Symmetry: none
Subunit: 61 residues, 4 copies
C-alpha cells in the first residue's frame, strides 16, 4: 500500500530502536492523524509494526 510503505521507510530513516508518535508522522507526511493511526494499527495486524504503550503510543519495527 501507499501509506504503509511511506510509514515504513520513514521509520528506517530514524533508527532501529527508534520509535515515533502518530501525530509526529501526521505532520511529517502531511496526512491526517486519524488516517496514520488507521494504517499504523493495520500494519500491526500484519506483524510489520510493533506498538509500545504510552500516551501517545510509540511505533517502531
Amino acid at each position: 500500500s501507499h501509506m504503509e510503505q511511506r510509514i515504513l521507510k520513514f521509520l528506517e530513516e530514524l533508527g532501529e530502536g527508534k520509535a515515533t508518535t502518530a501525530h509526529d508522522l501526521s505532520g511529517k507526511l502531511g496526512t491526517p492523524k486519524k488516517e496514520i493511526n488507521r494504517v499504523l494499527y493495520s500494519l500491526a495486524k500484519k506483524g510489520k509494526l510493533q506498538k509500545e504503550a504510552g500516551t501517545p503510543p510509540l511505533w517502531k519495527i
Copy 2:
C-alpha cells in the same frame, strides 16, 4: 540560562539553520508539560534568542 532554556536551545540548533518546530513537539521530546515549554519559548523570544513565526500552533526557530 536555566535548564529548560539550554535544553530547548540545543534542540533547535540540531535541526539545521532555517528549521522550526512547535511547543507541542518540544513538550513531548523533553517530557515537559506544554505550558512550561511555552513559558520558556516566549521568554527566549524576549531575549532575542528565539524567533516565532505565526500559525496555529506557532512555529519556533533560532533568532537570526
Copy 3:
C-alpha cells in the same frame, strides 16, 4: 446543532421519566450518524440539559 438538540430532547421526552436510551438507538430513530448523535449528547450533558449513566453503551436521560 440546536436542531438535533430538540429532536433528541423531544425523543427523550416521550421516552417517559427516568427512562434512558442509548446513542445507537437514537442513531436509528433519527436516521443520523451515531457520531453526530454522540457529539450532541455529550454537548447537551455539558449544558446540564442531559444526564449520562455508566454502562456499555452509556445510557442517556433528561437531566435533573
Copy 4:
C-alpha cells in the same frame, strides 16, 4: 453548578440591563478568576448568560 448559582444570584441582584466583569465577580465572590470565567462561558453555553464584547468582556443574565 455550585458556582453557577452564586454567580447567577449576583447578576440577579445586579440588575436586568446591567453587566459586570469576570475580574469583578472574582473579587466579590473570592473565587480565582479562571473559575469565574470557566463558569461564565459555560453558562453562556446553556443560554443562561449573555456575553457582550469588550476588553474585558461584560456579562449579564439572558
